[PDB]
Amino acid sequence: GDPPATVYRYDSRPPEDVFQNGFTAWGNNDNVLEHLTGRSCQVGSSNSAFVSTSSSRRYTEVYLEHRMQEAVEAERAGRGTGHFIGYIYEVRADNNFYGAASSYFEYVDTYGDNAGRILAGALATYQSEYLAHRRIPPENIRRVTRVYHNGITGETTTTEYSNARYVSQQTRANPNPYTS
Numbered sequence: 583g584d585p586p587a588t589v590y591r592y593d594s595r596p597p598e599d600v601f602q603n604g605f606t607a608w609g610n611n612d613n614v615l616e617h618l619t620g621r622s623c624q625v626g627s628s629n630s631a632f633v634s635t636s637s638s639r640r641y642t643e644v645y646l647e648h649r650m651q652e653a654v655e656a657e658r659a660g661r662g663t664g665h666f667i668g669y670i671y672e673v674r675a676d677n678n679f680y681g682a683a684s685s686y687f688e689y690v691d692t693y694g695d696n697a698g699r700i701l702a703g704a705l706a707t708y709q710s711e712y713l714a715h716r717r718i719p720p721e722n723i724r725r726v727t728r729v730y731h732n733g734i735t736g737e738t739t740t741t742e743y744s745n746a747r748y749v750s751q752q753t754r755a756n757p758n759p760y761t762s
């Protein structure tokens with residue numbers, strides 16, 4: 583029942599960036615509700631102070647596979663090329679990583695209105711999501727899986743790479759909700 587030591591992140595950017603530079607949050611907006619609903623992420627205001635991760639590798643696999651299928655749909659509709667490259671990073675969590683569900687409830691119990699606050703089961707409420715505040719340093723990033731789909735031939739190829747900058751130390755995610 584301890585907080586996870588290992589989390590995963592789907593991202594489009596390659597290890598030549600991420601293994602050396604880590605992940606940096608979009609900006610300084612630490613509103614937990616705006617992050618978890620996506621409003622402060624890339625498709626919204628692109629200013630979230632959080633880097634999203636999941637303790638469930640399967641979650642990031644569904645994400646990668648969905649983006650890959652959306653690429654392939656873009657060609658059956660005639661506005662795309664087929665090819666897709668995605669990455670799943672394996673990351674060591676530390677005290678700057680906070681449970682999304684715990685942080686969400688802390689926020690809405692204190693500042694929220696009614697919606698999705700009382701009727702909010704465990705599977706439904708950002709289950710296994712973890713928010714890294716501000717940065718995931720490169721020393722926390724252990725390895726990456728690259729998945730390449732060739733949209734012309736249909737071939738998919740999966741490869742793995744280790745980060746020489748990874749530092750192995752005993753850390754786990756924060757047991758407490760995030761608070762500003």
Ligand SMILES: NC(=O)c1ccc[n+]([C@@H]2O[C@H](COP(=O)([O-])OP(=O)(O)OC[C@H]3O[C@@H](n4cnc5c(N)ncnc54)[C@H](O)[C@@H]3O)[C@@H](O)[C@H]2O)c1
Nearest residue numbers: 591592593594606607608618620623624634635636642711
């Ligand atoms: N990514 C995951 O594995 C993951 C894990 C758990 C939850 N989520 C949830 O999924 C939703 C989408 O999350 P996300 O993590 O994909 O959003 P995001 O805005 O952090 O990343 C989406 C894309 O934006 C780009 N990007 C991100 N930060 C960047 C920066 N600082 N500079 C340049 N480009 C950058 C990358 O292309 C990235 O793939 C969120 O609501 C989140 O809570 C995602």
